[PDB]
Amino acid sequence: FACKTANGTAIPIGGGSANVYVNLAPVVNVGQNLVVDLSTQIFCHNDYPETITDYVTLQRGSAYGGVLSNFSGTVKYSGSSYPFPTTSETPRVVYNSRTDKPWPVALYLTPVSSAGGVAIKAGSLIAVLILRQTNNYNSDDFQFVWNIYANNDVVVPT
Numbered sequence: 795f796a797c798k799t800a801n802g803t804a805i806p807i808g809g810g811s812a813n814v815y816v817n818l819a820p821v822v823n824v825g826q827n828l829v830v831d832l833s834t835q836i837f838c839h840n841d842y843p844e845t846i847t848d849y850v851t852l853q854r855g856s857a858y859g860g861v862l863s864n865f866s867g868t869v870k871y872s873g874s875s876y877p878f879p880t881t882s883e884t885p886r887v888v889y890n891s892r893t894d895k896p897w898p899v900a901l902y903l904t905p906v907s908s909a910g911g912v913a914i915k916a917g918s919l920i921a922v923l924i925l926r927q928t929n930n931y932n933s934d935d936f937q938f939v940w941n942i943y944a945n946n947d948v949v950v951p952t
């Protein structure tokens with residue numbers, strides 16, 4: 795089991811960490827969602843589906859910088875929604891193919907009422923997402939850590 799990003803940055807068998815740079819809607823009004831769809835940027839696969847089934851959770855998701863201070867968050871994992879920053883490990887998604895499958899994570903971030911002006915700074919860390927991989931074969935329990943950075947400023951109109 796291993797993962798890679800849309801630009802080819804990979805985390806190999808056994809886990810590790812990688813940076814993911816995301817383009818963000820540049821203007822987001824109070825009452826609207828900023829959507830960060832990581833399923834278009836993080837992809838994973840099973841290296842031995844003949845014999846092994848892999849299990850993958852979002853173990854936790856943390857918010858940083860402007861996202862922590864200026865937004866109210868929800869994470870959708872494989873079709874179900876949870877608080878973000880997270881309060882529990884998600885259900886498992888099965889990975890059972892050698893063909894890449896997106897990691898089905900999307901953040902929905904809506905401005906808090908105090909938000910205004912440059913709410914996320916270009917280049918800043920906005921989230922850390924921990925993908926936890928186990929299987930039905932051995933005792934493997936690996937973390938794939940995704941550090942999410944903003945490619946651009948996000949302005950909340952005042």
Ligand SMILES: CCCCCCCO[C@H]1CO[C@H](CO)[C@@H](O)[C@H](O)[C@@H]1O
Pocket residue numbers: 795796807808839840841842843846847848928929931932934
């Ligand atoms: C012939 C026996 C092979 C032994 C395979 C033991 C280690 O397996 C690697 C290869 O990927 C499998 C399937 O994706 C993962 O479940 C593991 O966590 C780990 O990434």
